[PDB]
Protein backbone atom coordinates (compact mmCIF):
# COMPACT_ATOMS: atom_id res chain seq x y z
CA UNK A 1 0.00 0.00 0.00
CA UNK A 2 1.31 3.44 -0.93
CA UNK A 3 0.59 6.38 1.40
CA UNK A 4 -1.45 4.14 3.72
CA UNK A 5 -1.19 3.60 7.46
CA UNK A 6 -0.81 0.63 9.80
CA UNK A 7 -3.98 -1.32 10.41
CA UNK A 8 -5.27 -1.26 13.99
CA UNK A 9 -5.35 -4.75 15.42
CA UNK A 10 -8.54 -6.45 14.16
CA UNK A 11 -9.41 -3.73 11.62
CA UNK A 12 -9.45 -6.17 8.70
CA UNK A 13 -10.13 -9.67 10.04
CA UNK A 14 -10.95 -11.07 6.56
CA UNK A 15 -7.42 -10.22 5.41
CA UNK A 16 -5.65 -13.32 4.07
CA UNK A 17 -2.01 -14.02 3.11
CA UNK A 18 -1.18 -16.37 0.23
CA UNK A 19 2.17 -18.16 0.46
CA UNK A 20 4.08 -20.42 -1.84
CA UNK A 21 5.26 -23.34 0.29
CA UNK A 22 8.68 -23.95 -1.27
CA UNK A 23 10.47 -21.66 -1.36
CA UNK A 24 8.27 -20.15 1.36
CA UNK A 25 7.31 -16.77 -0.13
CA UNK A 26 4.39 -14.27 0.11
CA UNK A 27 2.63 -14.11 -3.27
CA UNK A 28 -0.49 -12.00 -2.87
CA UNK A 29 -3.38 -10.93 -0.64
CA UNK A 30 -6.85 -12.40 -0.46
CA UNK A 31 -9.98 -12.32 1.65
CA UNK A 32 -12.04 -14.67 3.82
CA UNK A 33 -15.59 -14.88 2.63
CA UNK A 34 -16.69 -17.96 4.62
CA UNK A 35 -15.04 -20.47 6.95
CA UNK A 36 -13.79 -22.57 4.00
CA UNK A 37 -13.69 -20.03 1.17
CA UNK A 38 -11.07 -17.44 0.31
CA UNK A 39 -11.29 -14.99 -2.58
CA UNK A 40 -8.20 -13.77 -4.50
CA UNK A 41 -7.22 -12.66 -8.02
CA UNK A 42 -6.66 -15.29 -10.74
CA UNK A 43 -3.33 -13.72 -11.83
CA UNK A 44 -2.11 -14.47 -8.32
CA UNK A 45 -2.46 -18.15 -9.14
CA UNK A 46 -2.16 -18.30 -12.92
CA UNK A 47 0.22 -16.19 -14.99
CA UNK A 48 2.30 -18.34 -17.43
CA UNK A 49 4.73 -15.56 -18.57
CA UNK A 50 5.90 -15.16 -14.96
CA UNK A 51 6.04 -18.95 -14.41
CA UNK A 52 2.90 -18.91 -12.25
CA UNK A 53 0.54 -21.91 -12.67
CA UNK A 54 -0.07 -23.17 -9.11
CA UNK A 55 -1.92 -26.20 -7.69
CA UNK A 56 -3.41 -26.56 -4.19
CA UNK A 57 -0.29 -28.44 -3.04
CA UNK A 58 1.97 -25.51 -3.98
CA UNK A 59 0.32 -22.95 -1.72
CA UNK A 60 -1.03 -22.31 1.73
CA UNK A 61 -2.83 -19.33 3.30
CA UNK A 62 -2.26 -17.49 6.55
CA UNK A 63 -5.18 -15.81 8.24
CA UNK A 64 -5.59 -13.56 11.27
CA UNK A 65 -2.23 -11.89 10.69
CA UNK A 66 -0.95 -8.39 11.37
CA UNK A 67 2.87 -8.56 10.94
CA UNK A 68 4.31 -9.56 7.55
CA UNK A 69 7.24 -11.58 8.91
CA UNK A 70 6.77 -12.32 12.64
CA UNK A 71 4.66 -15.41 13.46
CA UNK A 72 1.69 -14.85 15.80
CA UNK A 73 0.95 -17.78 18.17
CA UNK A 74 -2.82 -18.36 18.82
CA UNK A 75 -3.75 -15.48 16.53
CA UNK A 76 -2.54 -16.69 13.12
CA UNK A 77 -3.93 -19.79 11.44
CA UNK A 78 -2.30 -21.53 8.51
CA UNK A 79 -4.56 -23.42 6.09
CA UNK A 80 -4.03 -25.94 3.26
CA UNK A 81 -6.08 -25.68 0.05
CA UNK A 82 -8.46 -28.39 -1.16
CA UNK A 83 -9.05 -26.88 -4.63
CA UNK A 84 -8.35 -23.71 -6.62
CA UNK A 85 -10.98 -22.31 -8.97
CA UNK A 86 -10.19 -19.74 -11.66
CA UNK A 87 -12.95 -18.01 -13.63
CA UNK A 88 -13.23 -19.84 -17.01
CA UNK A 89 -13.20 -16.51 -18.92
CA UNK A 90 -10.17 -14.99 -17.13
CA UNK A 91 -8.04 -12.99 -19.53
CA UNK A 92 -4.30 -12.69 -18.90
CA UNK A 93 -2.94 -12.03 -22.38
CA UNK A 94 -4.43 -8.56 -22.61
CA UNK A 95 -6.33 -6.80 -19.88
CA UNK A 96 -6.91 -8.98 -16.79
CA UNK A 97 -10.65 -9.31 -17.42
CA UNK A 98 -12.40 -11.48 -14.80
CA UNK A 99 -9.24 -11.56 -12.65
CA UNK A 100 -11.03 -13.70 -10.03
CA UNK A 101 -10.20 -16.95 -8.28
CA UNK A 102 -11.66 -18.94 -5.39
CA UNK A 103 -9.84 -21.24 -3.01
CA UNK A 104 -11.41 -23.91 -0.79
CA UNK A 105 -9.59 -24.54 2.49
CA UNK A 106 -9.09 -28.20 3.45
CA UNK A 107 -10.57 -27.37 6.87
CA UNK A 108 -12.94 -24.73 8.27
CA UNK A 109 -11.00 -21.97 10.00
CA UNK A 110 -12.15 -21.00 13.51
CA UNK A 111 -13.38 -17.45 13.98
CA UNK A 112 -11.86 -15.11 16.60
CA UNK A 113 -11.22 -11.42 17.23
CA UNK A 114 -8.63 -11.68 14.44
CA UNK A 115 -10.50 -13.93 11.99
CA UNK A 116 -13.89 -13.07 10.49
CA UNK A 117 -15.44 -13.14 6.99
CA UNK A 118 -16.56 -10.17 4.96
CA UNK A 119 -19.90 -9.90 3.13
CA UNK A 120 -20.34 -10.24 -0.61
CA UNK A 121 -22.63 -7.48 -2.04
CA UNK A 122 -26.11 -7.83 -3.60
CA UNK A 123 -27.89 -5.61 -6.18
CA UNK A 124 -28.97 -3.08 -3.52
CA UNK A 125 -25.52 -2.74 -1.95
CA UNK A 126 -23.71 -2.68 -5.32
CA UNK A 127 -26.10 0.02 -6.65
CA UNK A 128 -25.82 2.04 -3.40
CA UNK A 129 -22.05 1.85 -2.85
CA UNK A 130 -20.42 1.58 -6.28
CA UNK A 131 -20.69 5.29 -7.01
CA UNK A 132 -17.94 7.60 -8.18
CA UNK A 133 -16.50 9.76 -5.41
CA UNK A 134 -17.49 7.16 -2.81
CA UNK A 135 -14.49 5.83 -0.90
CA UNK A 136 -13.58 2.22 -0.17
CA UNK A 137 -10.69 0.66 1.73
CA UNK A 138 -7.75 -1.36 0.41
CA UNK A 139 -5.36 -3.36 2.64
CA UNK A 140 -2.27 -5.48 2.16
CA UNK A 141 1.36 -6.27 2.86
CA UNK A 142 2.38 -5.03 -0.60
CA UNK A 143 5.23 -2.55 -1.20
CA UNK A 144 5.08 0.95 0.30
CA UNK A 145 6.38 2.51 -2.93
CA UNK A 146 7.02 1.71 -6.59
CA UNK A 147 10.83 1.47 -6.16
CA UNK A 148 10.78 -1.61 1.31
CA UNK A 149 7.93 -3.91 2.33
CA UNK A 150 5.90 -2.91 5.45
CA UNK A 151 6.36 -4.47 8.88
CA UNK A 152 2.60 -4.48 9.57
CA UNK A 153 -0.59 -4.58 7.49
CA UNK A 154 -1.26 -1.37 5.60
CA UNK A 155 -4.62 0.32 4.99
CA UNK A 156 -5.71 3.17 2.68
CA UNK A 157 -9.06 4.66 1.66
CA UNK A 158 -9.61 5.59 -2.01
CA UNK A 159 -12.45 7.15 -4.06
CA UNK A 160 -14.06 5.18 -6.86
CA UNK A 161 -13.47 6.95 -10.19
CA UNK A 162 -15.88 7.73 -13.09
CA UNK A 163 -15.57 5.17 -15.90
CA UNK A 164 -14.51 7.80 -18.54
CA UNK A 165 -11.60 8.86 -16.35
CA UNK A 166 -10.59 5.21 -15.83
CA UNK A 167 -10.94 4.52 -19.59
CA UNK A 168 -8.69 7.48 -20.42
CA UNK A 169 -6.03 6.73 -17.80
CA UNK A 170 -4.78 3.65 -19.66
CA UNK A 171 -4.50 2.19 -23.17
CA UNK A 172 -5.49 -1.20 -21.70
CA UNK A 173 -8.91 -2.37 -22.98
CA UNK A 174 -10.81 -1.83 -19.68
CA UNK A 175 -13.98 -3.97 -19.19
CA UNK A 176 -17.21 -3.62 -17.21
CA UNK A 177 -15.86 -6.35 -14.92
CA UNK A 178 -13.37 -3.94 -13.37
CA UNK A 179 -13.54 -0.43 -11.90
CA UNK A 180 -10.77 1.95 -10.94
CA UNK A 181 -10.21 3.85 -7.69
CA UNK A 182 -7.74 6.52 -6.51
CA UNK A 183 -7.32 10.30 -6.33
CA UNK A 184 -7.23 12.63 -9.35
CA UNK A 185 -3.99 14.73 -9.54
CA UNK A 186 -5.82 17.95 -8.58
CA UNK A 187 -7.39 16.44 -5.43
CA UNK A 188 -4.10 16.69 -3.52
CA UNK A 189 -4.42 13.41 -1.55
CA UNK A 190 -2.39 10.34 -2.61
CA UNK A 191 -2.40 6.55 -2.23
CA UNK A 192 -2.79 3.27 -4.12
CA UNK A 193 -2.07 -0.43 -3.86
CA UNK A 194 1.34 -1.72 -5.07
CA UNK A 195 3.27 -4.97 -5.72
CA UNK A 196 2.05 -7.57 -3.21
CA UNK A 197 -1.39 -6.06 -2.65
CA UNK A 198 -2.81 -8.06 -5.58
CA UNK A 199 -5.74 -10.29 -4.68
CA UNK A 200 -6.54 -8.43 -1.48
CA UNK A 201 -9.94 -6.81 -0.77
CA UNK A 202 -11.52 -3.49 -1.66
CA UNK A 203 -14.14 -3.12 1.08
CA UNK A 204 -16.88 -0.59 1.80
CA UNK A 205 -18.99 -0.24 4.94
CA UNK A 206 -22.77 -0.01 4.42
CA UNK A 207 -24.55 2.97 6.11
CA UNK A 208 -27.75 0.87 5.95
CA UNK A 209 -26.64 -2.10 8.07
CA UNK A 210 -23.18 -1.20 9.43
CA UNK A 211 -21.51 -4.18 7.64
CA UNK A 212 -18.34 -4.48 5.55
CA UNK A 213 -18.76 -5.55 1.94
CA UNK A 214 -16.07 -6.59 -0.50
CA UNK A 215 -16.71 -4.58 -3.63
CA UNK A 216 -13.42 -5.24 -5.35
CA UNK A 217 -10.28 -7.32 -5.64
CA UNK A 218 -7.00 -5.45 -6.20
CA UNK A 219 -6.07 -6.46 -9.77
CA UNK A 220 -3.60 -4.11 -11.49
CA UNK A 221 -2.05 -0.67 -11.88
CA UNK A 222 0.52 0.81 -14.29
CA UNK A 223 3.15 1.53 -11.40
CA UNK A 224 1.80 2.69 -8.02
CA UNK A 225 0.41 6.07 -6.99
CA UNK A 226 1.27 7.84 -10.24
CA UNK A 227 -0.46 11.09 -11.21
CA UNK A 228 -3.19 10.52 -13.77
CA UNK A 229 -3.02 6.78 -13.12
CA UNK A 230 -5.56 4.78 -11.13
CA UNK A 231 -5.87 1.35 -9.51
CA UNK A 232 -7.94 -1.42 -11.11
CA UNK A 233 -10.09 -3.81 -9.09
CA UNK A 234 -12.17 -6.85 -10.06
CA UNK A 235 -15.90 -6.00 -9.73
CA UNK A 236 -17.05 -8.59 -7.20
CA UNK A 237 -20.79 -8.07 -7.73
CA UNK A 238 -20.67 -8.44 -11.56
CA UNK A 239 -19.07 -11.87 -11.02
CA UNK A 240 -21.14 -12.97 -8.03
CA UNK A 241 -23.07 -15.56 -10.09
CA UNK A 242 -19.85 -17.47 -10.74
CA UNK A 243 -18.89 -17.17 -7.04
CA UNK A 244 -22.26 -18.76 -6.20
CA UNK A 245 -21.98 -21.46 -8.90
CA UNK A 246 -18.66 -22.65 -7.48
CA UNK A 247 -19.57 -22.35 -3.81
CA UNK A 248 -23.00 -23.90 -4.35
CA UNK A 249 -21.43 -26.88 -6.09
CA UNK A 250 -18.53 -26.90 -3.56
CA UNK A 251 -16.68 -28.50 -6.51
Amino acid sequence: IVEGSDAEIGMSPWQVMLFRKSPQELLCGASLISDRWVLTAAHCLLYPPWDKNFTENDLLVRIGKHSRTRYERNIEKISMLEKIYIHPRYNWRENLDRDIALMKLKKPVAFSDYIHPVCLPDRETAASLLQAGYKGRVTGWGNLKETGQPSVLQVVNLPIVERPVCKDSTRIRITDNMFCAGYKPDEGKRGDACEGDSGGPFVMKSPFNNRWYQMGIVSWGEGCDRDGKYGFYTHVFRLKKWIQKVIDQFG
Partner: peptide, 28 residues
Amino acid sequence: EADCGLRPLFEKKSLEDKTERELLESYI
Protein backbone atom coordinates in the same frame (compact mmCIF):
# COMPACT_ATOMS: atom_id res chain seq x y z
CA GLU B 1 -22.45 -15.46 6.66
CA ALA B 2 -25.34 -14.46 8.92
CA ASP B 3 -22.74 -12.44 10.78
CA CYS B 4 -20.36 -11.43 7.98
CA GLY B 5 -18.60 -8.08 7.98
CA LEU B 6 -19.22 -7.29 11.64
CA ARG B 7 -15.80 -6.95 13.23
CA PRO B 8 -15.35 -8.47 16.74
CA LEU B 9 -13.13 -5.68 18.01
CA PHE B 10 -15.03 -2.81 16.32
CA GLU B 11 -18.72 -3.18 15.42
CA LYS B 12 -19.27 -5.89 18.03
CA LYS B 13 -17.99 -3.55 20.76
CA SER B 14 -19.48 -0.41 19.16
CA LEU B 15 -16.04 1.12 18.62
CA GLU B 16 -15.27 3.24 15.56
CA ASP B 17 -11.97 2.58 13.75
CA LYS B 18 -9.48 5.35 12.96
CA THR B 19 -10.49 6.14 9.36
CA GLU B 20 -13.94 4.59 8.62
CA ARG B 21 -15.72 7.95 9.02
CA GLU B 22 -13.80 8.95 5.86
CA LEU B 23 -15.85 6.38 3.97
CA LEU B 24 -19.01 7.64 5.71
CA GLU B 25 -18.34 11.29 4.91
CA SER B 26 -17.77 10.31 1.25
CA TYR B 27 -21.44 9.24 0.95
CA ILE B 28 -22.46 12.92 1.30
